[PDB]
C-alpha cells in the first residue's frame, strides 16, 4: 500500500521514487485521549490495519544441496515401504507444491538414498510459518548428462502489522504501538472520520519536532484541494509563515485558520474542551 | 463537576470490588455549592479519593 507523499520535495520526483513507494499517508491527531501511549508510543485503529494499513510481507529464499563419486541421493521416492501423510506438500517428483502452508517442522524436500534405500525428509525449522511461492531447479552444464543436485526455493511470510513495530514518520519521531483500539472507542470528528493514528502531544516539547505540525497543515491543505505543496526547505521566511500560507487555504476551504478540527470522545460521547489538532502525515 | 460526573470519576479509580479501600463501603462528601445547582471542585474530588 505504499503511497507517494503529498508534501514531497521537488527532488522526490527527479529520481522517481514514485516507482518505489516507501510509505504512505495517515490521519494523525496529537491527542492524549487514549492514555495508553505516553512520551514515545503510538496507537493504530483496529479498523485501519483490519483493511491493510501498513501491510507487508517477507521473502526467505533457501538453498538446498543434495548428496552432502557416484550420486546416491535422488529427489523423489523409491519402491519399498514408506509412511504416508506427508504427500500434501511434496510431489512425486521430489518438489513441494507452490502455495502450500509450511510452518516449522514440515517437509520441504524429500530425498531417496540408495546406500540406505530410504526416503528421508529434510525438515524446515525457522521462526515464522511461510508460504512457498516458487521453486527453482539448477543443473550444472556438461557434455554428459547430469542429474539435478541443487534446488533453490523461495518463501513468503505474511507479516501482519501488529503492535511493537517501530512505526514512524519522515521527521525522526520513532515510536511503537501500545494497543490497537477499536473505531467505536476512537474519537470521531465532526464529519465522522476517526483518526486511525494518534501520536502523543507531550513528546513535542522534548523532541522539538515542529515539522510534523507544519507538514500536517500542508498535508490536509493538500488533500482538500488536490494540489500538492512541495516541501523544499529554505524557501520561506519569517515574513511569510508556512502556518499562515497553509492556514489561509483551510480558511477558504471551510476549516479554521489554525488547522484545529473540533471532535468528540468515543467512550463518553461529549464535546472536548477546545479545538484539537488533526492532519495527515507521511 | 456535577452529581453525574463526580461519582463516575470516583468509582473508575477506587473499584472496591478489586479492593483499594478499607471500610468496604465508599462514602460521599457534601458539595461545594448547594444553590441553584449542586457543583463540586477538583480540590474535592482529590480530597475524597
Amino acid at each position: 500500500t505504499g503511497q507517494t507523499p503529498i508534501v514531497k520535495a521537488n527532488l522526490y520526483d527527479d529520481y522517481g521514487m514514485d516507482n518505489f513507494p516507501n510509505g504512505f499517508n495517515a490521519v494523525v491527531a496529537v491527542i492524549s485521549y487514549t492514555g495508553y501511549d505516553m512520551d514515545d508510543a503510538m496507537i493504530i485503529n483496529k479498523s485501519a490495519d483490519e483493511r491493510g494499513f501498513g501491510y507487508g510481507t517477507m521473502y526467505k529464499t533457501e538453498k538446498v544441496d543434495l548428496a552432502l563419486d557416484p550420486i546416491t541421493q535422488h529427489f523423489g521416492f523409491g519402491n519399498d515401504e514408506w509412511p504416508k501423510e506427508w504427500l500434501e506438500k511434496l510431489d512425486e517428483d521430489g518438489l513441494p507444491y507452490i502455495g502450500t502452508y509450511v510452518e516449522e517442522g514440515d517437509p520441504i524436500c524429500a530425498y531417496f538414498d540408495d546406500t540406505l534405500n530410504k526416503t528421508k525428509i529434510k525438515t524446515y525449522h525457522s521462526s515464522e510459518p511461510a508460504y512457498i511461492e516458487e521453486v527453482n531447479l539448477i543443473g550444472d552444464e556438461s557434455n554428459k548428462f547430469q542429474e539435478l543436485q541443487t534446488v533453490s526455493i523461495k518463501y513468503r511470510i505474511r507479516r501482519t502489522p501488529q503492535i511493537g513495530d517501530k512505526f514512524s514518520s519522515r521527521h525522526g519521531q520513532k515510536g511503537v504501538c501500545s494497543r490497537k483500539w477499536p473505531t467505536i472507542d476512537m474519537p470521531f470528528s465532526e464529519t465522522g472520520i476517526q483518526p486511525d493514528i494518534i501520536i502523543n502531544p507531550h513528546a513535542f516539547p522534548s523532541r522539538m519536532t515542529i515539522g510534523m505540525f507544519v507538514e500536517s497543515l500542508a498535508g490536509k491543505a493538500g488533500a482538500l484541494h488536490g494540489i500538492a505543496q512541495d516541501s523544499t526547505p529554505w524557501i520561506f521566511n519569517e515574513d511569510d509563515t508556512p502556518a499562515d500560507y497553509f492556514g489561509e487555504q483551510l480558511a477558504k476551504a471551510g476549516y479554521n485558520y489554525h488547522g484545529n478540527e473540533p471532535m468528540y470522545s468515543g467512550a463518553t460521547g461529549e464535546e472536548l474542551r477546545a479545538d484539537i489538532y488533526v492532519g495527515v502525515v507521511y | 463537576f456535577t452529581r453525574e460526573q463526580y461519582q463516575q470519576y470516583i468509582y473508575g479509580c477506587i473499584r472496591p470490588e478489586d479492593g483499594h479501600t478499607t471500610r468496604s463501603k465508599i462514602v460521599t462528601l457534601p458539595p461545594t455549592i448547594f444553590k441553584p445547582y449542586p457543583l463540586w471542585t477538583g480540590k474535592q474530588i482529590i480530597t475524597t479519593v
Binding site: - | 473508575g12 472496591p16 470490588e17 478489586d18 468496604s24
Partner: protein, 100 residues
C-alpha cells in the same frame, strides 16, 4: 444465562445498600446508557461504571442506594426505564418518517 450477570460478593453490603455487579461482553454501550438511567433515580446513593482492562471484555457497574430499597431492584428499574426509553425513541422515529 449464568455467565452474563454475576453478583459477586467481594464488594456488596449485607442489607446491600451498596453492591457491585459484573457483566461480561459489555462496554460503554450499556455502561454509559444504563448509568445515565439509574443515576436519575432519587433513591441512588452512588453509581458508576469501571472497566477492568480494555484487552479483557468485562464491565463492573457500581450501584449504591438509600434505604427502603435494595440495589438489585434499582438495577431492574434502570433496565425497564432504559427499555421504555428505547421504546419511545423508536416509536416516535417510526411515526415521524411518515410526516415528511
Amino acid at each position: 444465562d449464568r455467565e452474563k450477570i454475576k453478583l459477586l460478593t467481594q464488594a456488596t453490603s449485607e442489607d446491600g445498600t451498596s453492591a457491585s455487579f459484573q457483566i461480561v461482553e459489555e462496554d460503554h454501550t450499556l455502561g454509559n446508557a444504563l448509568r445515565y438511567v439509574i443515576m436519575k433515580n432519587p433513591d441512588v446513593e452512588f453509581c458508576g461504571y469501571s472497566i477492568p482492562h480494555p484487552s479483557e471484555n468485562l464491565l463492573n457497574i457500581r450501584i449504591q442506594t438509600y434505604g427502603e430499597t435494595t440495589a438489585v431492584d434499582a438495577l431492574q428499574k434502570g433496565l425497564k426505564d432504559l427499555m421504555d426509553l428505547c421504546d419511545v425513541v423508536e416509536s416516535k422515529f417510526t411515526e415521524k418518517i411518515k410526516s415528511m
